[PDB]
Design a protein around this ligand. Structure first.
Ligand SMILES: O=C(O)CNC(=O)C(=O)O
Ligand SMILES: [Mg+2]
Ligand code: NI
Ligand SMILES: [Zn+2]
Length: 331
């Protein structure tokens, strides 16, 4: 078995190897990358996502989200308070303000310490989940707006044609902006490219150990657990590395820098935070190996998780028994 300790692997494809996306994902899996739940891909030196980022300030963040925490430093939830629209140029100025900027620090580890110590005492503002792409249309390799669609993968694998579309999302972050512990919708893969700015630190649980994280989460968030049998689908709970270590939960961590891709694998729980002003782009995707994870994915039916139009068909075809109850939660 390749990568039996489930370490995060880092890949350096050549420009030749960067041509065929599906093939390279299958290669990474042949080396055991999926066992970690997360892999880093450093693009060939010849590759670029676009020529410059000089003209992005007029992108609109229609609903910036203020991430307000409740709990204790290592075990907290966050809720998202909607704020007034602002441009990316306005948001970048805000991120660089004295109130919101990254503090002085020695290195990523020092910054990570300061994050866990201090996050809950602040409410950073996240420009998340903005439909769109920063890849130049002429970028042919690993262009997240030109991937094969999950609907087409389900059709190729299973023969059933379904409605729905699959497009990327932009994320504009600042210091302390936070992504809560989650897997993807329908336990899909994700791919995330850090276009610009300051780093993003990731934490990940190997897929084979995801249920250990779920059991800890039920213990640590007991009211939430009673409310919903899949409450991590709400994407609100945070648990620190120290707490995970105290409770024996297997995990790994890595920092992504600008110019790097990360891939999350089916049922790889992940969480993290941004170091300062940045912009990332991410999208879900599928491979043949995903289908069995899709069929087994938990679902929130309490009404909180509320997701895209396109998840309907995935539930309806892969999980017909659950369909009725899950759709009640959607309506
Ligand atoms: O970058 C973020 O805030 C969150 N991204 C992801 O969870 C992802 O790419 O799967
Ligand atoms: Mg612009
Ligand atoms: Ni994710
Ligand atoms: Zn729920």
């Amino acid at each position: 078995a390749q990568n039996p300790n489930c370490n995060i692997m880092i890949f350096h494809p050549t420009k030749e190897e960067f041509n065929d996306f599906d093939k390279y994902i299958a290669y990474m899996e042949s080396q055991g990358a999926h066992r970690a739940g997360l892999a880093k891909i450093i693009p060939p030196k010849e590759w670029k996502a676009r020529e410059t980022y000089d003209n992005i300030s007029e992108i609109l963040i229609a609903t910036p989200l203020q991430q307000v925490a409740s709990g204790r430093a290592g075990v907290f939830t966050q809720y998202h308070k909607k704020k007034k629209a602002m441009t990316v140029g306005e948001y970048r100025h805000l991120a660089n303000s004295k109130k919101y900027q990254t503090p002085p620090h020695q290195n990523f580890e020092d910054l990570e310490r300061k994050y866990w110590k201090n996050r809950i005492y602040n409410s950073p503002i996240y420009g998340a989940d903005i439909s769109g792409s920063l890849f130049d249309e002429n970028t042919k390799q690993w262009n997240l707006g030109h991937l094969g669609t999950i609907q087409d993968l389900l059709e190729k694998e299973c023969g059933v044609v379904i409605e729905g579309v699959n497009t990327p999302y932009l994320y504009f972050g600042m210091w302390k902006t936070t992504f809560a512990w989650h897997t993807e919708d329908m336990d899909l893969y994700s791919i995330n490219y850090l276009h610009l700015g300051e780093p993003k630190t990731w934490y990940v649980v190997p897929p084979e150990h995801g249920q250990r994280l779920e059991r800890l989460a039920r213990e640590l968030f007991p009211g939430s657990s009673r409310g919903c049998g899949a409450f991590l689908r709400h994407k609100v709970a945070l648990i620190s590395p120290t707490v995970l270590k105290e409770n024996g939960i297997p995990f790994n961590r890595i920092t992504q820098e600008a110019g790097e891709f990360m891939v999350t694998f089916p049922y790889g729980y992940h969480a993290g935070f941004n170091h300062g002003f940045n912009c990332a782009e991410a999208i879900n995707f599928a491979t043949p190996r995903w289908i069995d994870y899709g069929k087994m994915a938990s679902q929130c039916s309490c009404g909180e998780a509320r997701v895209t139009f396109s998840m309907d068909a995935f539930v309806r075809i892969l999980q017909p028994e659950r369909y009725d109850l899950w759709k009640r939660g959607q309506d």
